[PDB]
Write a protein that binds this ligand. Structure first.
Ligand SMILES: NC(=O)C1=CN([C@@H]2O[C@H](COP(=O)(O)OP(=O)(O)OC[C@H]3O[C@@H](n4cnc5c(N)ncnc54)[C@H](OP(=O)(O)O)[C@@H]3O)[C@@H](O)[C@H]2O)C=CC1
Ligand SMILES: CCc1nc(N)nc(N)c1C#CCc1cc(OC)cc(-c2ccncc2)c1
Length: 186
């Protein structure tokens, strides 16, 4: 088990979701960025683990579940078994991380990526240890019903650059955004 990372795309009004969908129209390269960041393992024979909440899970198009090339884990207290397509389910982020140490996952998992939503993000951000936040700042306001918790700038440092990540402004569909990487080690 390697790094603990969160990854999120967030609007200017701190929005991340709207009606079980993204607040903004599809941004192809933001998507490609998400896919390549979450899928790419730094170790041969190992896959990355994606941890998501139930709503995030069901917001993903059925034909794209589970997230290809990655081990999918769903967080929920109501579900009695992993949803169709998933094989792992945990009552909390802490339980999931503890699960990553058991033999069934211990030697198969490289990086751990939290991919939403709000309360998963919260729990992760407040979790102790080396944590990295990959935050796409979408430089525009969008109507949202789900929100990204504010980053404690007394715990986190904003990195000026991160390896493999471009720090310049991106633009698709008339929408400008930027890749940021925050870090804490406690
Ligand atoms: N822009 C972005 O980077 C992303 C956007 N989104 C968007 O956000 C919306 C979904 O996010 P959101 O509304 O926050 O929903 P979530 O994905 O967080 O799902 C909420 C449910 O997940 C379970 N859950 C969540 N957090 C925890 C936790 N910490 N411990 C245990 N269980 C937990 C609970 O289920 P239960 O009731 O069973 O206990 C809860 O009811 C979608 O519209 C999606 O498109 C999502 C991720 C990323
Ligand atoms: C690309 C956004 C995104 N960007 C970033 N920087 N971090 C994130 N955590 C997410 C996210 C998310 C959650 C999410 C929502 C979603 O709504 C239809 C679709 C997918 C998805 C669809 C098809 N293949 C894979 C994933 C994923």
């Amino acid at each position: 088990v390697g790094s603990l990372n969160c990854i999120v795309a967030v609007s200017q009004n701190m929005g991340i979701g709207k009606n079980g969908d993204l607040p903004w129209p599809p941004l192809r390269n933001e998507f490609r960025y998400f896919q390549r960041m979450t899928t790419t393992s730094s170790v041969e024979g190992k896959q990355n683990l994606v941890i998501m909440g139930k709503k995030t899970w069901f917001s993903i198009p059925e034909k794209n579940r589970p997230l290809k090339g990655r081990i999918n884990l769903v967080l929920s207290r109501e579900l009695k078994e992993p949803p169709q397509g998933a094989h792992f389910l945990s009552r909390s982020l802490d339980d999931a991380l503890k699960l990553t140490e058991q033999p069934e996952l211990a030697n198969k998992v490289d990086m751990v990526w939290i991919v939403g939503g709000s309360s998963v993000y919260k729990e992760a951000m407040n979790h102790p240890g080396h944590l990295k936040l990959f935050v796409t700042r979408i430089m525009q306001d969008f109507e949202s019903d789900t929100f990204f918790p504010e980053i404690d700038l007394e715990k986190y440092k904003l990195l000026p650059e991160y390896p493999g990540v471009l720090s310049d402004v991106q633009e698709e569909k008339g929408i400008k955004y930027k890749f940021e990487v925050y870090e804490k080690n406690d």
